Design a protein around this ligand. Structure first.
Ligand SMILES: Cc1cc2nc3c(=O)[nH]c(=O)nc-3n(C[C@H](O)[C@H](O)[C@H](O)COP(=O)(O)OP(=O)(O)OC[C@H]3O[C@@H](n4cnc5c(N)ncnc54)[C@H](O)[C@@H]3O)c2cc1C
Ligand SMILES: [Cl-]
Length: 487
């Protein structure tokens, strides 16, 4: 008979899941599996991101229980757990969504070898990306496009991405009873307390497919907003209602299908003819993701400077003091420190807020490597994605895809244009809550009498600027200009 495993790694969803539909097909028993390494901590990851994963698994659990089945969270490494359960469960087919990340390729190969030894058929559909990213490279003549203009041209030549896959059946073949490796007490979803985390998650975005589809429908409640979306014109200071979709954590874990999102965009575009076009449109934002997945998956050492054929070799400074101040939100520049606090508190910041902090640490003020910034973002972002985090840090550091190092964001003026009263700053830096708006972006300029009334004396309650932006940016630009002459 047919006994199948659907292995979740990403794709933590039941919609547009071609691997689950194939697994459930003609199956006597389907085994829904997530593999959790119980020592991933003891070895880098925030409770905000890890708990979002756990909430995503608890949603999957509820969804499978509704359909007569059960999510099995196996503890161990895939290479050691799958050979046993292949034979324990009499598995004939193993299904999972294809992953193009470097560690994914090594892991999936070894598992595919194990499945062959056990007589197990492997089916690996593509669904995390709009397209088969290797088909895009082959249609482009064997190399990934290196500009979005050429990439947008390529996808339009290829045509619409595949349609979202149908929904799974209302009743699923369950695991077989009294299998020892599927015992309930060994296969449940743990809490954040039981994985070793001692401080609670604080983010306001809840994990799971059910919340991802609720947040999708919220975005599409105003079609005219979807149609006219222009990414560079949105507001980074907006926190009560963020100015973009905040679907990124759900797309990263696959709680939301990229293809379903794309299909819903085109239906709105069909009825709104003046709709915005790539790159600034919402569809364009999914294409930024695909562009970076396509380049990054075909580029060696993509997450690194050294050995990376697309990254400029820049002489960044090893300055732990500047880095530490940036990471711990104590630069003395409230726009920067507020954004870095939202990072550690919510794990999500608007795209231009990320611009402001990434420029500051790299080609604008502190001249620290974008790798040191990417590592900090990897720990705290709930949307952390190998290829998107790496390419946007190379972009922001003018090390790849971007070359206009004379455009330096001001850590004082940038946010002021959107939020003159500093509502964003007061929310995330309550120490400045009583600071008059005239000084809230430059508190070191306030007379001492003003500092004492507001309760924020610089050097006592809030740090002093670690640099003079005018001096620092002028130095950093000079150095960047000599490097671009050096290459
Ligand atoms: C230094 C830096 C690091 C970043 N690291 C990440 C990361 O780890 N994970 C991540 O998802 N994005 C990352 N981004 C890209 C971008 O800032 C986020 O995708 C965006 O802020 C998510 O908000 P949203 O879902 O509201 O996006 P929307 O504007 O609503 O866009 C919809 C979707 O398009 C995709 N998208 C949007 N902007 C980009 C972009 N610039 N590059 C690639 N895909 C994009 C995302 O999947 C996003 O959810 C980074 C950007 C910078 C400057
Ligand atoms: Cl500016």
């Amino acid at each position: 008979v047919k006994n199948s495993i659907i292995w979740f790694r990403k794709g933590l969803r039941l919609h547009d899941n071609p691997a689950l539909l194939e697994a459930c097909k003609d199956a006597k028993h389907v085994y829904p599996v997530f593999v959790l390494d119980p020592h991933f901590l003891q070895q880098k990851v925030s409770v905000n991101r890890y708990n979002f994963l756990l909430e995503s698994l608890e949603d999957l659990q509820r969804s499978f229980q509704a359909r007569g089945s059960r999510l099995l969270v196996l503890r161990g490494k895939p290479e050691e757990v799958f050979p046993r359960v292949f034979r324990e469960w009499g598995v004939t087919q193993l299904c999972f969504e294809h992953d193009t990340e470097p560690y994914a390729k090594v892991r999936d190969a070894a598992v595919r070898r194990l499945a062959a030894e056990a007589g197990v058929e492997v089916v690996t559909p593509i669904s995390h990306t709009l397209y088969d990213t290797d088909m895009l490279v082959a249609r482009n003549g064997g190399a990934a496009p290196l500009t979005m203009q050429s990439f947008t041209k390529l996808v339009d030549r290829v045509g619409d991405p595949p349609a979202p896959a149908p929904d799974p059946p209302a009743a699923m073949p369950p695991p077989a009873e009294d299998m020892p490796s599927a015992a309930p007490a060994a296969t449940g979803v743990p809490t954040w307390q039981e994985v070793g985390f001692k401080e609670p998650p604080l983010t306001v975005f809840k994990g799971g497919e059910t919340e991802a589809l609720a947040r999708l429908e919220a975005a599409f409640q105003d079609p005219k907003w979807v149609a006219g979306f222009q990414k560079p014109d949105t507001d980074p200071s907006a926190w009560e209602k963020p100015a973009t979709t905040v679907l990124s954590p759900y797309l990263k874990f696959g709680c939301l299908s990229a293809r379903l999102f794309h299909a819903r965009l085109l239906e709105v575009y069909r009825r709104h003819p003046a709709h915005s076009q790539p790159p600034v449109s919402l569809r364009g934002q999914l294409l930024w993701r695909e562009f970076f997945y396509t380049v990054g998956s075909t580029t060696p050492n993509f997450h690194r400077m050294a050995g990376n054929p697309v990254c400029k070799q820049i002489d960044w400074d090893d300055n732990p003091e500047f880095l530490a101040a940036w990471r711990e939100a104590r630069t003395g520049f409230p726009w920067i420190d507020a954004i870095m606090t939202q990072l550690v508190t919510w794990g999500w910041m608007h795209h231009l807020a990320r611009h402001s902090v990434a420029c500051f640490l790299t080609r604008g003020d502190l001249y620290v490597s974008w790798e040191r910034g990417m590592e900090v973002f990897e720990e705290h972002l709930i949307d952390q994605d190998h290829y998107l985090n790496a390419a946007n840090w190379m972009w922001l550091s003018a090390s790849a895809f971007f070359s206009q190092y004379f455009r330096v964001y001001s850590p004082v003026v940038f946010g002021k244009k959107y939020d003159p009263e500093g509502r964003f700053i007061r929310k995330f830096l309550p120490v400045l809550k009583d600071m008059p708006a005239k000084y809230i972006y430059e508190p070191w300029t306030a007379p001492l009498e003003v500092q004492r009334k507001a309760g924020c004396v610089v050097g006592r309650d809030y740090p002093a600027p670690i640099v003079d932006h005018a001096v620092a940016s002028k130095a950093c630009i000079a150095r960047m200009a000599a490097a671009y002459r050096r290459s």
